[PDB]
Structure formats: structure tokens, C-alpha cells
Design a protein around this ligand. Structure first.
Ligand SMILES: [Ca+2]
Ligand SMILES: [Cl-]
Ligand code: NA
Ligand code: NA
Ligand code: NA
Ligand code: NA
Ligand code: NA
Ligand code: NA
Ligand code: NA
Length: 472
């Protein structure tokens, strides 16, 4: 009979286990015998306190490096401000030791945990690449919340070395099964940011996670976008509890916060899942998340049912992660077929945007070809356009099954005149839909200003397979 952890702060870890059912259902996974044994997770951040009394027992130097100083030791740089505590906080979320009379427990409290010190210095493309590409046949799961500053006016993603690291990771990482890159969707809610403008979370190669408050609401810091897959609990207002974890200087904290605290919890759940089936590919893991995640009691004004009957939100993706359901579905999971990629160049001539532009196109999704797709995974609308004030644009994409994805919401602080240069807006909301038929792209000026510009390229890129569907 499974006995839950006795750690002093475990009762404060409301998101792990509750009578309330406002939790991630992690205890059910533990009771099935999955606690993360044999799985390796790395926190890509500001370092890890490897001698922390609640981390030392699970610490793995093979999951660690210091890319800022170019040496193996990921110890945080100690300062009066305690600036470099974040990675240590995230590590504890994943893999804090259980039943040791110290603090709380990790989601995967028998997993091995390391950290990369890479944010404490100048973060170049090369630094990002070397962090993403750290020991990819030892580390199973990476967790990160970096990328562009979420100031609501930036459009930025991985440069060439980092993008190459992503493709190398998912292709040859983890014995060919693919590195699992878990990402926080962003924290620019206050600046009205729209997270598809962040190429790291907008990537198909990252498994992107947003936040819900304890009372099941969309936190002030949250960013909505179509690229997000799912949600874990994090902080909210001052009546709502927060994340309880390991802190710098061998301390315990009850006030870890933000979307950056949601990603590590997801990484821990994904570790439990990988323990339940070590053969899951990077794409398998995303399927599991889509199928098992739970909308219930998450409050949003944009819940919509897609073409295969699943509820999806731009704030929450497919909903709250469910660890028990993940590990259950993982055990007899059949590996998905090889990924197909159908490239459809939509325009025959450039199109004036004006006040509103609608582009309709009926596609066959590579019928008759080896990239024929009847089961969609990710879809991208890769857009090249000029515009005089970028943040006034809102962009939507409607699938043949009638699923309306917001690719871009108005960003009031984005006054850029640089437009978009083949930016690959991505949506997860049409997952498992048949993409044959009429797609609709909508671009609109949300302001009353006389704005102007031209859409010069629209590539619809479809990823997925042609086999093995479930009944909706
Ligand atoms: Ca502990
Ligand atoms: Cl590709
Ligand atoms: Na170091
Ligand atoms: Na970020
Ligand atoms: Na960040
Ligand atoms: Na960049
Ligand atoms: Na591969
Ligand atoms: Na992503
Ligand atoms: Na169709």
C-alpha cells in the first residue's frame, strides 16, 4: 500500500495532492509505482545548488554544466540579492528528495536532476545551442523558460545554432527517440504579450506549458497563444497558494511563482511518464499530453471544441496535466508513425491587407504523396508581410473542421514597422483533425487607424501522419 511522503512541507504542496481535486493527480502516478527512477532531467537556467539537502541525493553531474564559465560545475553565483536562485527552485519542483525530513518533494522524487548554468552571463546563440545540446544521450528531459523578454513588443526565436540544436535533439537525442524539451509559454501577461511571437515556445520541438492559479483562473502573468499544449498550477493573487520548493542557500521557499514554475512541474510529470514507457518518442509525449489533459474547473472565456471533440483554450491548451492519466496511457502506447510534412504554398499573388484580409484555400494535404496527412499534429501558417504598426494586427486560422486558432492577438505595445519575415505561427488546436479541405486565414486591423501593408507569402505547413485514429 503506497504511503505518501512525510516531508514537512508536503502538505503545503497543494498542486501535487489534494482531497479537493484541484491538483495534478501525481499521487495516483506514485501509487502505480512511478516516481521517476532511471529518468534524467536538466534545468536550463541560472545554475543548481548541487549540495542542497533536498537535491543532493538526486543530483546528477552528467545532467549539469556551466556554459557561462565553461566548466562542469553548475553551482549558482552567490550574491547579496540572491539573483541566481531560480534554477535551484525549478530543480526541486522536479526532483526534490522525498521522505528525508526536508522541505517538500519533487513530482519525480526519485529522478536524477541536474542544471545548466547558462543565464548568468551573455546569452548568445552558441550558449543556447550548447545548453540544449548538453549530453543528449544521457539527459532525457530539458526544462526551460528563456527566450525573448516578454515585453509585448518583441518577435524573436532561436537563431541558427539553437534551431540546429533543437533538430539534432529531437532526431538523434535519447537514442533516436528525441530529446524532450519542456518550455514555459511566457510571463508577459501584464504587457499583453501573445506567445506565438516567441519562437522558442512557438516551436513544434518544445512541449509548451502555461499556468493556472489555485482557484482555477488565468493568472495575471499568463500569455495566450495557439502553440501552447497544456497547463500546470502555479501562483496567482495573494489569497492563492504558490509553489513550494528548494531555495538558494539550502533553504525552503513557499513563494515560487509564474509560468516558469509551471514548466518544471510538467517536466516532472513527463519524467513519471517516461518511466512508465522508456520507448516514447518526443512526438509520442505530445500525443499523450493532448489526449490526457483535463479542462475541468479551469476558467476561461475561450474554451472551444475542436474537430475531434476535444476542448482547447488559448490560455490552457488542452487543460491541466494529469499524471495518473499520463502514466496509465503510456504503458501500452503504440509508437506513432513517422512524421510527415506537407508544404502548401498558398498565394499566387501578394495581397493588400488594408482593414481586413481573408485568404481561403482548399487543400488536398499532399494526397497521393508520401507526405499525405489525414491525422494532423502541428500546423503552421508561415507568413511574410509588411505592415506599418505590427501590434494592431490580429491573425486567425480556421481548419476545415471549423477550428478557429488565434495565431496572433493585438499587442498594444508593439509599434514595430518591421512586419513578419516568414514567421511560422503554430497551432496545436487542430491536433488529430483531417486537414483536407478549406483553410481560412484572417488578418485584421484591430485599431481605428488607417494602417497599411501587404501579405507576400503564406505557406501552410502541415505535420502529422496518415494512420491509426481514435473515435472522437
Ligand atoms: Ca524533501
Ligand atoms: Cl521540419
Ligand atoms: Na561553474
Ligand atoms: Na521565455
Ligand atoms: Na523567461
Ligand atoms: Na534569437
Ligand atoms: Na530519430
Ligand atoms: Na512548443
Ligand atoms: Na476535409
Amino acid at each position: 500500500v503506497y504511503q505518501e511522503p512525510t516531508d514537512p512541507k508536503f502538505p503545503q504542496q497543494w498542486y501535487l495532492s489534494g482531497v479537493t481535486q484541484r491538483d495534478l493527480n501525481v499521487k495516483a502516478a506514485w501509487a502505480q509505482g512511478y516516481t521517476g527512477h532511471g529518468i534524467v532531467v536538466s534545468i536550463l537556467d541560472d545554475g543548481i545548488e548541487k549540495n542542497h539537502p533536498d537535491l543532493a541525493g538526486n543530483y546528477d553531474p552528467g545532467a549539469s554544466f556551466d556554459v557561462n564559465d565553461q566548466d562542469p560545475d553548475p553551482q549558482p553565483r552567490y550574491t547579496q540579492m540572491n539573483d541566481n536562485r531560480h534554477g535551484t527552485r525549478c530543480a526541486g519542483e522536479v526532483a526534490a528528495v522525498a521522505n528525508n525530513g526536508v522541505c517538500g518533494v519533487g513530482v519525480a522524487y526519485n529522478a536524477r536532476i541536474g542544471g545548466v548554468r547558462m543565464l548568468d552571463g551573455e546569452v548568445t546563440d552558441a550558449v543556447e545551442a550548447r545548453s540544449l545540446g548538453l549530453n543528449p544521450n544521457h539527459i532525457h528531459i530539458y526544462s526551460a523558460s528563456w527566450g525573448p523578454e516578454d515585453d509585448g513588443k518583441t518577435v524573436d526565436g532561436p537563431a541558427r545554432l539553437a534551431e540546429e540544436a533543437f533538430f539534432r535533439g529531437v532526431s538523434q537525442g535519447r537514442g533516436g527517440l528525441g530529446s524532450i524539451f519542456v518550455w514555459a509559454s511566457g510571463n508577459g501577461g501584464r504587457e499583453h504579450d501573445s506567445c506565438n511571437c516567441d519562437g522558442y515556445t512557438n516551436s513544434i520541438y518544445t512541449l509548451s506549458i502555461s499556468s493556472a492559479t489555485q482557484f482555477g483562473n488565468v493568472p495575471w502573468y499568463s500569455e495566450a497563444c495557439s502553440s501552447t499544449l497544456a497547463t500546470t498550477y502555479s501562483s496567482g493573487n495573494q489569497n492563492e497558494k504558490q509553489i513550494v520548493t528548494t531555495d538558494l542557500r539550502q533553504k525552503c521557499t513557499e513563494s515560487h511563482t509564474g509560468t516558469s514554475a509551471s514548466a518544471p512541474l510538467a517536466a516532472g510529470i513527463i519524467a513519471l511518464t517516461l518511466e512508465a514507457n522508456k520507448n516514447l518518442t518526443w512526438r509520442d509525449m505530445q500525443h499523450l499530453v493532448v489526449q490526457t489533459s483535463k479542462p475541468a474547473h479551469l476558467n476561461a472565456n475561450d474554451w472551444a471544441t475542436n474537430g475531434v471533440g476535444r476542448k482547447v483554450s488559448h490560455s490552457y491548451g488542452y487543460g491541466l496535466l494529469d499524471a495518473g492519466a499520463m502514466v496509465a496511457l503510456a504503458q501500452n502506447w503504440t509508437t506513432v508513425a513517422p512524421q510527415r510534412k506537407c508544404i502548401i504554398d498558398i498565394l499566387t499573388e501578394p495581397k493588400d491587407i488594408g482593414k481586413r484580409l481573408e485568404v481561403r484555400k482548399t487543400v488536398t494535404a499532399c494526397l497521393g504523396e508520401p507526405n499525405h496527412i489525414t491525422r494532423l499534429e502541428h500546423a503552421q501558417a508561415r507568413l511574410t508581410l509588411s505592415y506599418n504598426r505590427r501590434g494592431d494586427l490580429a491573425i486567425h486560422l480556421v481548419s476545415p473542421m471549423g477550428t478557429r486558432s488565434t495565431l496572433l492577438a493585438a499587442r498594444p505595445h508593439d509599434y514595430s514597422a518591421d512586419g513578419f519575415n516568414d514567421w511560422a505561427f503554430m497551432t496545436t488546436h487542430s491536433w488529430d483533425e483531417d486537414p483536407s479541405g478549406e483553410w481560412v486565414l484572417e488578418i485584421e486591423n484591430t485599431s481605428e487607424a488607417n494602417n497599411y501593408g501587404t501579405l507576400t507569402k503564406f505557406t501552410l505547413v502541415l505535420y502529422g501522419t496518415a494512420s491509426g485514429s481514435l473515435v472522437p
